[PDB]
Amino acid sequence: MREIVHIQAGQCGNQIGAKFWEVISDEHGIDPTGSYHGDSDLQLERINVYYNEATGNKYVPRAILVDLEPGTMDSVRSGPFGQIFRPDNFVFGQSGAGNNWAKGHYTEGAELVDSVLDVVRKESESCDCLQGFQLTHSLGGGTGSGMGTLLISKIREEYPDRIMNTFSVMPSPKVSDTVVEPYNATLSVHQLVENTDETYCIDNEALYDICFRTLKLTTPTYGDLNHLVSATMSGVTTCLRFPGQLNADLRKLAVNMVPFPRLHFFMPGFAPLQYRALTVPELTQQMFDSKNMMAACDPRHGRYLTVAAIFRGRMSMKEVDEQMLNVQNKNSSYFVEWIPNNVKTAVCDIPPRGLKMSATFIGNSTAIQELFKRISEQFTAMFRRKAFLHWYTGEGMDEMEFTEAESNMNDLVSEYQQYQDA
């Protein structure tokens, strides 16, 4: 029954994970009680990808909530859909991780990982056919980043032939907690290159800009940013959650979106960001405008290796293809020619809450290298003076592991550059 196990870790990871569940629970007609009151069965046909059934026939998210301190999870619990989650599925320590990758990966997080793997095992073992795992986290803190990557390693060890998928929030000076964010992210990306099959790169720089230069929010809160993230995450998982002419699953996705095993970092796109529904031509233009991208790279600086796009709502499948095909055949400079038919299009009838038309885009572009450069430059600006490193050497790390993580990110960048020029 192609079940997915969802894991959310750290402050960011749990905040956006929680919103995610709010949104999709509403789309599937589940209320804060886990009770179904929807009007279709398109809501229920694949409900088991994300939800386990209850004794009274209630639906309970296949979700595991993880943190090294309890604050955020207390908030999640006391939030709107807080009580939907399995309470055994809250796994947390007391001490925190101090925005320190080393504490999440090596010291504090090591002490909690096994209890997390216990809840994971308990959720996997009752899966008819488990697809893989979905992790929500940021890369700039300590828990979601250090402990999140540690977790991905353990899961890969225990389930080496399942798919690992992340939604990974990338740090930016614009919207920043601490200065060590580049260190934590460079260390984390290195893990993600070896141990995931698909990673959605969600850049906080982009979310800030869309919030500021577009949504016209002058002082954008984390709730504002998370609302974009929530919409993107719902769009990006539509084809898994709903029945269509496609059977979408994680493995087929990875096979069709990843031509080289290391280049599996995707730029998501969304449209629109209202009483006038958009027309298919507007969806198409907006989706592919840099301004609707959530990774803060401009797609005209690179080339698309692959693209997956869904349109949500009742519209003209013919007009979609016409428009899709049109934007390709207007912009062939920005798609690779050596991968025939590298743009794929689908349609769902059910739109999301509050829109009668929407469109979501998953792009594997070489322009994502811009993001990794941005991080590399920042990492190097400190590391060349070994600034701030004592926080990590004090947990047992050596400079060597840093130099290697740096190196592997720059190699990743070189790889993206090689294919942008082929």
Partner 1 sequence: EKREHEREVIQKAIEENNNFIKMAKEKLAQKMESNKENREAHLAAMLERLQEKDKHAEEVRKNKELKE
Ligand X SMILES: COc1ccc([C@H]2[C@@H](C)C(=O)N2c2cc(OC)c(OC)c(OC)c2)cc1O
Chain residues binding ligand X by CB under 6 A are 236, 238-240, 246, 248, 252-253, 256-257, 306, 308-310, 342, 344-346, 360
Site string for Mg ion, 185-204 (x = CB under 5 A): --------------------
* Among 43, 75, 107, 256, interactor with partner 1 by CB under 8 A: 107
Tokens of 341: 């038919």
Q: Distance of CA 127 to CAs 53, 91, 143, 243, 318, Å?
A: 12, 21, 27, 20, 38
Residue 16 sits in the site that holds partner 1 (CB under 8 A): no
* DSSP bridge pairs for 337: none
Cβ 73 to ligand X shortest distance, Å: 28
Among positions 102, 139, 258, 297, the unique one binding partner 1 when judged by CB under 8 A: 102
DSSP string, 140-203: SSSIIIIIHHHHHHHHHHH-TTSEEEEEEEEPBTTB-S-TTHHHHHHHHHHHHHHH-SEEEEEE
By beta-carbon proximity to ligand GDP, the closer residue of 175 and 355 is: 175
144 has binding-site annotation = yes
Give the span between the Cα atoms of 339 and 136, in whole angstroms: 30
**138, interface contact from partner 1, Mg ion, ligand GDP, none, CB < 5-8 Å by kind:** ligand GDP
Element (H, E) at 7: strand 3-9
Instruction: Give, as ranges, the residues between 125 and 154 that touch ligand GDP (CB under 6 A).
Output: 138, 140-145
To the question of whether residue 393 is assigned a binding role by annotation, the answer is no
Residue 307, beta-bridge partner list: 343, 363
Q: Which does 395 bind (CB under 5 to 8 A by kind): ligand X, Mg ion, partner 1, none?
A: partner 1
Query: If binding is defined by CB under 5 A, does position 145 make contact with Mg ion?
Result: no
CB contact at 8 A, 352 and 231:
yes
> Annotation-wise, does 3 bind a ligand?
no
Q: Does 153 bind partner 1 (CB under 8 A)?
A: yes
Is 10 part of any known ligand binding site?
no
Q: Is 256 annotated as a binding residue?
A: no
Q: Is 302 annotated as a binding residue?
A: no
The reply to whether omega before 272 is within 30° of 0 (cis) is yes
Q: What is the largest CA-CA distance in the chain?
A: 61
Q: Which residues bind partner 1 (CB under 8 A)?
A: 102, 105-107, 110, 153, 394-397
Which parts are annotated binding residues for GTP?
A: 11, 69, 138, 142-144, 204, 226
